Enzyme design. Structure first.
Site, mmCIF file in Angstrom:
data_model
loop_
_atom_site.group_PDB
_atom_site.id
_atom_site.type_symbol
_atom_site.label_atom_id
_atom_site.label_comp_id
_atom_site.label_asym_id
_atom_site.label_seq_id
_atom_site.Cartn_x
_atom_site.Cartn_y
_atom_site.Cartn_z
ATOM 1 C CB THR A 1 49.791 8.520 1.627
ATOM 2 O OG1 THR A 1 51.011 8.631 0.886
ATOM 3 C CG2 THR A 1 49.985 7.526 2.760
ATOM 4 C CD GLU B 1 58.084 43.434 -2.390
ATOM 5 O OE1 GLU B 1 57.216 43.714 -3.246
ATOM 6 O OE2 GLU B 1 58.300 44.142 -1.383
HETATM 7 N N1 GTP Z 1 45.607 18.653 1.711
HETATM 8 C C1 GTP Z 1 45.102 17.906 0.736
HETATM 9 N N2 GTP Z 1 45.819 16.828 0.258
HETATM 10 C C2 GTP Z 1 45.310 16.062 -0.737
HETATM 11 C C3 GTP Z 1 44.071 16.349 -1.287
HETATM 12 N N3 GTP Z 1 43.820 15.431 -2.247
HETATM 13 C C4 GTP Z 1 44.867 14.578 -2.316
HETATM 14 N N4 GTP Z 1 45.792 14.951 -1.378
HETATM 15 C C5 GTP Z 1 47.094 14.315 -1.125
HETATM 16 O O1 GTP Z 1 47.727 14.153 -2.377
HETATM 17 C C6 GTP Z 1 48.401 12.915 -2.454
HETATM 18 C C7 GTP Z 1 47.943 12.170 -3.703
HETATM 19 O O2 GTP Z 1 47.964 13.050 -4.804
HETATM 20 P P1 GTP Z 1 46.666 13.306 -5.721
HETATM 21 O O3 GTP Z 1 46.495 14.777 -6.022
HETATM 22 O O4 GTP Z 1 45.432 12.744 -5.059
HETATM 23 O O5 GTP Z 1 46.975 12.455 -7.053
HETATM 24 P P2 GTP Z 1 46.916 13.122 -8.517
HETATM 25 O O6 GTP Z 1 47.678 14.424 -8.562
HETATM 26 O O7 GTP Z 1 45.475 13.310 -8.930
HETATM 27 O O8 GTP Z 1 47.642 12.041 -9.465
HETATM 28 P P3 GTP Z 1 46.917 10.676 -9.922
HETATM 29 O O9 GTP Z 1 45.610 10.482 -9.188
HETATM 30 O O10 GTP Z 1 47.855 9.537 -9.605
HETATM 31 O O11 GTP Z 1 46.653 10.725 -11.408
HETATM 32 C C8 GTP Z 1 48.078 12.148 -1.186
HETATM 33 O O12 GTP Z 1 49.214 12.197 -0.354
HETATM 34 C C9 GTP Z 1 46.950 12.921 -0.541
HETATM 35 O O13 GTP Z 1 47.096 12.926 0.860
HETATM 36 C C10 GTP Z 1 43.343 17.433 -0.812
HETATM 37 O O14 GTP Z 1 42.242 17.701 -1.289
HETATM 38 N N5 GTP Z 1 43.866 18.208 0.202
HETATM 39 C C1 LNU Z 2 49.766 -0.895 0.651
HETATM 40 C C2 LNU Z 2 48.904 -1.169 -0.585
HETATM 41 O O1 LNU Z 2 47.598 -0.630 -0.379
HETATM 42 C C3 LNU Z 2 46.752 -0.570 -1.444
HETATM 43 O O2 LNU Z 2 46.281 -1.633 -1.869
HETATM 44 C C4 LNU Z 2 46.364 0.774 -1.864
HETATM 45 C C5 LNU Z 2 46.882 1.963 -1.397
HETATM 46 C C6 LNU Z 2 46.253 3.032 -2.042
HETATM 47 C C7 LNU Z 2 45.325 2.538 -2.934
HETATM 48 N N1 LNU Z 2 45.380 1.120 -2.836
HETATM 49 C C8 LNU Z 2 44.550 0.167 -3.619
HETATM 50 C C9 LNU Z 2 43.319 -0.261 -2.862
HETATM 51 C C10 LNU Z 2 42.227 -0.750 -3.579
HETATM 52 C C11 LNU Z 2 41.070 -1.160 -2.911
HETATM 53 O O3 LNU Z 2 40.025 -1.631 -3.683
HETATM 54 C C12 LNU Z 2 40.282 -2.664 -4.636
HETATM 55 C C13 LNU Z 2 40.993 -1.088 -1.517
HETATM 56 C C14 LNU Z 2 42.090 -0.600 -0.808
HETATM 57 O O4 LNU Z 2 41.972 -0.545 0.570
HETATM 58 C C15 LNU Z 2 42.916 0.217 1.320
HETATM 59 C C16 LNU Z 2 43.254 -0.187 -1.473
HETATM 60 C C17 LNU Z 2 44.448 3.314 -3.814
HETATM 61 O O5 LNU Z 2 43.410 2.753 -4.524
HETATM 62 N N2 LNU Z 2 42.775 3.716 -5.252
HETATM 63 C C18 LNU Z 2 43.381 4.836 -5.013
HETATM 64 C C19 LNU Z 2 44.447 4.648 -4.114
HETATM 65 C C20 LNU Z 2 45.348 5.752 -3.629
HETATM 66 C C21 LNU Z 2 46.704 5.264 -3.097
HETATM 67 C C22 LNU Z 2 46.563 4.478 -1.784
#
Ligand code: GTP
Ligand code: LNU
Ligand code: ACP
Ligand code: GDP
Ligand code: CA
Ligand code: CA
Ligand code: CA
Ligand code: MG
Ligand code: MG
Lengths: 54, 309, 437, 426
Positions: free
Chosen positions: C179, C254
């Site tokens: 997340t 419904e």
């Molecule tokens: N249950 C479930 N949750 C998912 C899945 N993929 C992502 N999530 C949840 O969705 C949240 C992130 O939303 P995403 O759908 O990955 O992001 P997105 O809609 O593609 O939007 P962007 O990547 O920012 O462009 C996180 O809290 C994940 O835990 C999945 O395949 N199954």
């Molecule tokens: C609290 C802030 O946490 C981070 O930085 C953080 C949190 C998240 C991410 N990211 C960046 C990141 C980059 C990385 O590679 C450069 C290695 C990481 O290890 C956990 C995290 C991230 O990234 N790509 C998709 C996502 C989904 C959102 C969660």
């Protein structure tokens, strides 16, 4: 405890059991808020470019 | 190292409980708003039960049972006692009460008129959750202009010498498994009018010398029976057995004894204090059975385990 | 026969959609290539499964679905997976750059460039419908696309399909399952903008699916594949009444009628049982009474909360397998005399029951064991507000310092939209309190 | 197809840059000639992020080598992987910058920046979806510091919607070339505060201490220091180069790590830091404890003197992902006082199966801590010690600068320090 609306078929069956009785924005309005956000983006970028020119 | 938070500074009981936790070197107190806590000593009002049990990798425990207010609020206790099939049937230990909204106005006057008719003891006491004791129904309903009207024990047991009225306070602890533990030590509050605290040892001695009986046989059996009835009634409504967080709570039961050595339940306190002489023993017991049972650290019990299915 | 169009937005919605359609095909006997041997009406028909599958002259059953994502990696898995032959290219829509976990980026900046294309592809499927009921929208709360672009799509759908119903399957953010830190911002932003556009929304807290997978399936570190297969079963039991012969919840209207008397309070709680591990060969089949009782255990709810401290506005029981109406009533009678089931005064205390004789279908090789009878309960309890309170509290913590706000203002959003959204949630929490207290 | 454009400027920038491409080239199985010879699919899945594919299955780093003197760039071309770089991407002058920020930013560097932007434009024009740029440079010299920040300013003007990321080496009297290093570092930090989204603060004082105290190296060389920097750069970019449960990019990193625009200077950490024991396998508990220990921080700031705004942890190797979540949650719930309470769940963990060369498993730490202010205070004090007497200013006024630009540079960094202090007491 009453059973009502019982319907049956080959796939399954459904009914209801009662235990106790009781006692939008238009397309124009959306386009304006979207275009408004794009104006604020373009204005913030113009200020950046103005800043870089200085 | 376990972590806990304190959200009720006014609690003398858990102020001492927190003092003992730190004295073990294995518990660390955090800021009141830090969510990474294993134990919450929560506030009395608006405790956020909905935010408990959602911290990954943390077993969370709180010192209050969500829903126990039904038992600790006077109007709710009366309703619970009247509408519960497991209680309303009996209730030979709960005084005749009525909930009067400022409703059971007609039902109260129905039994009231029946008493003045027969010339019986028609003295009722009205309070809420300011009190007024009167024998005239008019003065009671006007005093409250939500309250409850309850029969005043006109024939109480009076300790002698002194012609003194008294009440018994029992501390009951219910842990996350819903074991009911009755503290061995109680307290009697003497009226002193025809230092106002008599402990069980003296009271037991008096009962033997005066009435030729014991506290256990003449009173304590009924107390344990009442405590068990009230708590087993709401168990399915407040049990945290399969919940994402855990609950324990210390309770304060107040009893009255009539001249026939019959016990009557007065009220139940959900945030009770303790007797100054018993704060240490009870608080240490709270840590033993309620806290360290879930978070163990690195032998006669002071509690009487009230058995139940 | 009236058609339903499913729309999957973002990674969560696409991967969850891919799991549902895999299951739908297994339940309806549709092979990966779209062929359905049991369908004797070649190239057409008005059967119940035609609510979700159109038919070509060659006998291919094509899902009435459209996949949309601002980046191409997740939807490329669909183009290559086992069921690639199912969908056609027009159904799969992808961009170049995702929303970077930023609602403002998915709603305003990036969404504004692709909204028209999506609406067109949807109009294509709608033009094949003799009587379109509405749409089923799958998406996450926390994703930049799932939150930002979904709310934009919902507004446009209310414009272009004013008389149609819209139902949501929403993924509630859980820190344990990958997340971003700003997911509370996005969750509240998209709930506020979508609230008056959705007729009924089923929230699924990833925290719940995660623990159900760890405790009932004995999975140490569940993956999205594990989570999605379990979610698809639940979604299946909800949409089964639309895909099979029946008389309960036979159309999207419904759902609103049976589960949502108050329009704003349209988030029913879902409880599912039994979830048995496949690795467990010796499985003692649970009875109707035992599975119906489990519907009132918080450990089986799609959102963790305590219905005991709320009030029910409606309750629906959806059985699949060897269930007979007699056993259900004998189980209800027992659970009433034991559980805490308080209904609001302005609603009858009862249960709408639906039984489908076909037991749940389990993906071959999955983690769920085949069972003889399962049940999904849909109850509109005020206890689900606990999830809103948690989310709004995390929102308040960050917004009090304006943390990360600049990323949203930098895309064209105004700081006032934050406060407006939070206020609507404050009203939402108050509506629940005035109904169940 | 989110491509990244790499730029390395100056002596330090080109030495750590070259080492970076040697390390990750080995991990992705690319030999010095550009031919792939790995054995796993994970090596090539996201190889396009850092490499361009030439005819013949040849992979060419998307790297641009820049310097105002040829000395160091000639060493790169002669080094191990020297032949892997695109020859046209070598952009260099002949005058040098004499450890003078003004020469790199205003005089000598201005004469060469356009030809650099020409190469950058050619690389970007052939990108399917450009993420942004990553720059390697020191802040104490003239080219990497002065011209490097000039490039950043001009790159932003031409790509205002792309991410700018840098690996910036901070000077230290413990490892010093000239006395004017605080002047050049103070001038650059302001450029970085304004024109980058993510800056990995690589403090030469910390690198020296890790070599001296921990690795037990009596006389650390720049090679020893760059060994740590290579290990760190491989770590913080793992989730950008390989596939997994978290396929990250530069923008999602900035979104989750930067709660306020100016506070985007990160503390990197790495574990293990073993001294040559290189056979003894580390346990997940040990990786987690060292990873958060100040002795593994590359910025020479005490984390317990400040508070963590956000944290990203990356674990590499085949390990118990269950035990990973347990140890991470243990660190947080034990020291929850060092994590700000107004950003819930600010510690994110990622796992990659492929470990770095020579290790069974590793852990990389990316922290946005308010204790980073100690680094800027250190520089600001050394700056003020000389500036109060206008010492060595003539090297700069002779290139067109006036004292006012120095007065503003100091004020800007003292503000930066005050801003970190504001959120450390929130
Ligand atoms: N249950 C479930 N949750 C998912 C899945 N993929 C992502 N999530 C949840 O969705 C949240 C992130 O939303 P995403 O759908 O990955 O992001 P997105 O809609 O593609 O939007 P962007 O990547 O920012 O462009 C996180 O809290 C994940 O835990 C999945 O395949 N199954
Ligand atoms: C609290 C802030 O946490 C981070 O930085 C953080 C949190 C998240 C991410 N990211 C960046 C990141 C980059 C990385 O590679 C450069 C290695 C990481 O290890 C956990 C995290 C991230 O990234 N790509 C998709 C996502 C989904 C959102 C969660
Ligand atoms: N039905 C009844 N008959 C006789 N006396 C009664 C009574 N109800 C209450 N009392 C008297 O009042 C006391 C309990 O009343 P009340 O509940 O108001 O006390 P309280 O709750 O305000 C403070 P505490 O919690 O210490 O009892 C009893 O101890 C007794 O003296
Ligand atoms: N870590 C590291 N630091 C270096 C290296 N070379 C130079 N430096 C540092 O960079 C500063 C000198 O800047 P330099 O890069 O040589 O100047 P430039 O070529 O004009 O950009 C001093 O603080 C040195 O300590 C190197 O190879 N590794
Ligand atoms: Ca057909
Ligand atoms: Ca509508
Ligand atoms: Ca010249
Ligand atoms: Mg995405
Ligand atoms: Mg040099």
């Amino acid at each position: 405890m009453e059973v009502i609306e019982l319907n049956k078929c080959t796939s399954g069956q459904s009914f209801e059991v009662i235990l106790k009785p009781p006692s939008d924005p238009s397309l124009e309005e959306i386009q304006k808020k979207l275009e408004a956000a794009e104006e604020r983006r373009k204005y913030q970028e113009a200020e950046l470019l103005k800043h870089l020119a200085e | 190292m376990y972590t806990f938070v304190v959200r009720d500074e006014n609690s003398s009981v858990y102020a001492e409980v927190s003092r003992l936790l730190l004295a073990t070197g294995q518990w660390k107190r955090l800021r009141k708003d830090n969510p990474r806590f294993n134990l919450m000593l929560g506030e009395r009002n608006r405790l956020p039960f909905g935010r408990l049990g959602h911290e990954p990798g943390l077993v969370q425990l709180v010192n209050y049972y969500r829903g126990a207010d039904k038992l600790c609020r006077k109007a709710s206790l009366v309703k619970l006692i009247k509408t519960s099939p497991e209680l309303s049937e009996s209730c030979t230990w709960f005084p005749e009460s009525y909930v009067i909204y400022p409703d059971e106005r007609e039902v109260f006057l129905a039994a009231y008129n029946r008493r003045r008719e027969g010339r019986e003891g028609n003295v009722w006491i009205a309070k809420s959750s300011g009190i007024l004791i009167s024998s005239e129904a008019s003065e009671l309903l006007d005093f409250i202009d939500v309250h409850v009207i309850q029969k005043y024990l006109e024939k109480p047991l009076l300790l002698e010498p002194g012609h003194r009225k008294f009440d018994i306070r029992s501390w009951v602890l219910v842990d996350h498994l819903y074991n009911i533990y009755l503290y061995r030590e109680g307290v009697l509050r003497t009226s002193s009018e025809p230092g106002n605290e008599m402990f069980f040892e003296e009271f037991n001695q008096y009962l033997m010398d005066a009435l030729n009986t014991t506290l256990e046989n003449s009173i304590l059996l009924q107390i344990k029976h009442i405590i068990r009835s009230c708590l087993m009634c709401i168990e399915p409504a407040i049990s945290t057995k399969h919940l994402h967080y855990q609950s324990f709570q210390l309770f304060g039961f107040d009893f009255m004894v009539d001249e026939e050595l019959k016990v009557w339940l007065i009220e139940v306190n959900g945030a009770p204090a303790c007797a100054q002489k018993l704060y240490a023993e009870l608080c240490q017991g709270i840590v033993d059975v309620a806290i360290s049972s879930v978070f163990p650290l690195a032998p006669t019990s002071i509690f009487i385990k009230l058995h139940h299915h | 026969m009236r058609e339903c169009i499913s729309i999957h937005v973002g990674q969560a919605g696409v991967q969850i959609g891919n799991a549902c359609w895999e299951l739908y095909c297994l339940e309806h006997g549709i092979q990966p290539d779209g062929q359905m041997p049991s369908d004797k009406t070649i190239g057409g028909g008005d059967d119940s499964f035609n609510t979700f599958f159109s038919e070509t002259g060659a006998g291919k059953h094509v899902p009435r679905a459209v996949f949309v994502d601002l980046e191409p990696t997740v939807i490329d898995e669909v183009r290559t997976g086992t069921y690639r032959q199912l969908f056609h290219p027009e159904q799969l829509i992808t961009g170049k750059e995702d929303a970077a976990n930023n609602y403002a980026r998915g709603h305003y900046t990036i969404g504004k460039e692709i909204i028209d294309l999506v609406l067109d592809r949807i109009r294509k499927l709608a033009d094949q419908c003799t009587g379109l009921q509405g749409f089923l929208v799958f998406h996450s709360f926390g994703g930049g696309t799932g939150s930002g672009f979904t709310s934009l799509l919902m507004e446009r759908l209310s414009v272009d399909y004013g008389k149609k119903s819209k139902l949501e399957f929403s993924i509630y953010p859980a820190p344990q399952v990958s997340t971003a830190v700003v997911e509370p911002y996005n969750s509240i932003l998209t709930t506020h903008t979508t609230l008056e556009h959705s007729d009924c929304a089923f929230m699924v807290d990833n925290e719940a699916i995660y623990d159900i997978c760890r405790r009932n399936l004995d999975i140490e570190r569940p993956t999205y594949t594990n989570l999605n297969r379990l979610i698809s079963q639940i979604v299946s039991s909800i949409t089964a009444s639309l895909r099979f012969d029946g008389a309960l919840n036979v159309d999207l209207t419904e759902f609103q009628t049976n589960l949502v008397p108050y329009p704003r309070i349209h988030f029913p709680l879902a409880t599912y049982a039994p979830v048995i591990s496949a690795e467990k060969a010796y499985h003692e089949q649970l009875s109707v009474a035992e599975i119906t009782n489990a519907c009132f255990e918080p450990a089986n709810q799609m959102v963790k909360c305590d219905p005991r401290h709320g009030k029910y506005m409606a309750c629906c029981l959806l059985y699949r397998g060897d269930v007979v109406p007699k056993d259900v009533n004998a189980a209800i009678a027992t659970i009433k005399t034991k559980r805490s089931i308080q209904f609001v005064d302005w609603c009858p205390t009862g249960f709408k029951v639906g039984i489908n004789y076909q037991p749940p279908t389990v993906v071959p090789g999955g983690d769920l064991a085949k069972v003889q009878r399962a049940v999904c309960m849909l109850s509109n309890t005020t206890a689900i507000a606990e999830a809103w309170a948690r989310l709004d509290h995390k929102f308040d913590l960050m917004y009090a310092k304006r943390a990360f706000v600049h990323w949203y203002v930098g895309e064209g959003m105004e700081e006032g939209e934050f406060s407006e959204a939070r206020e609507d949630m404050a009203a939402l929490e108050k509506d629940y309190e005035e109904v169940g207290v | 197809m989110r491509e990244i454009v790499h730029i390395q400027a100056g002596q330090c920038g080109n030495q750590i840059g070259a080492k970076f491409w040697e390390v990750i080239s080995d991990e992705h199985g690319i030999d010095p000639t550009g031919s792939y010879h790995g054995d796993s699919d994970l090596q090539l899945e996201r190889i396009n992020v850092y490499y361009n594919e030439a005819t013949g299955n040849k992979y060419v780093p998307r790297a641009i080598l820049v310097d105002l003197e040829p000395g160091t760039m000639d060493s790169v071309r002669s080094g191990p992987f020297g032949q892997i770089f695109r020859p046209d991407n070598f952009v260099f002058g002949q005058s040098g910058a004499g450890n003078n920020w003004a020469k790199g930013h205003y005089t000598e560097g201005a004469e060469l920046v356009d030809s650099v932007l020409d190469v950058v434009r050619k690389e970007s024009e052939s990108c399917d979806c450009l993420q942004g740029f990553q720059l390697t440079h020191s802040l104490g010299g003239g080219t990497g510091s002065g011209m490097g920040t000039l490039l950043i300013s001009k790159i932003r003007e031409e790509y205002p919607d792309r991410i700018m990321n840098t690996f910036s080496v901070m000077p230290s009297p413990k490892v010093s070339d000239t006395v004017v290093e605080p002047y050049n570092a103070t001038l650059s930090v302001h450029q970085l505060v304004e024109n980058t989204d993510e800056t990995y603060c690589i403090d030469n004082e910390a690198l020296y201490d890790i070599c001296f105290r921990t690795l037990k190296l009596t006389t650390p060389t720049y090679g020893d220091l760059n060994h740590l920097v290579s290990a760190t750069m491989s770590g913080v970019t793992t989730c950008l180069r390989f596939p997994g449960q978290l396929n990250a990019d530069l923008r999602k990193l900035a979104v989750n790590m930067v709660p306020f625009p100016r506070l985007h200077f990160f503390m990197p950490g790495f574990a293990p830091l073993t001294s040559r024991q290189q056979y003894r396998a580390l346990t997940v508990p040990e990786l987690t404890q060292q990873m958060f220990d100040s002795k593994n921080m590359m910025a020479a700031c005490d984390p317990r003197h400040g508070r963590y705004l956000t944290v990203a942890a990356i674990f590499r190797g085949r390990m118990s992902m269950k035990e990973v979540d347990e140890q991470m949650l243990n660190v947080q719930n034990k020291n929850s006082s060092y994590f700000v309470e107004w950003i819930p769940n600010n510690v994110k963990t990622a796992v990659c199966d492929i470990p770095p060369r020579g290790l069974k498993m590793s852990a990389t730490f990316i922290g946005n801590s308010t204790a980073i202010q100690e680094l800027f205070k250190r520089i600001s004090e050394q700056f003020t010690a000389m500036f109060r007497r206008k010492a060595f200013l003539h090297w700069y006024t002779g290139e067109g600068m006036d004292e006012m630009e120095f007065t503003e540079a100091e004020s800007n960094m003292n503000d930066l320090v005050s801003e970190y202090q504001q959120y450390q007491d929130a």
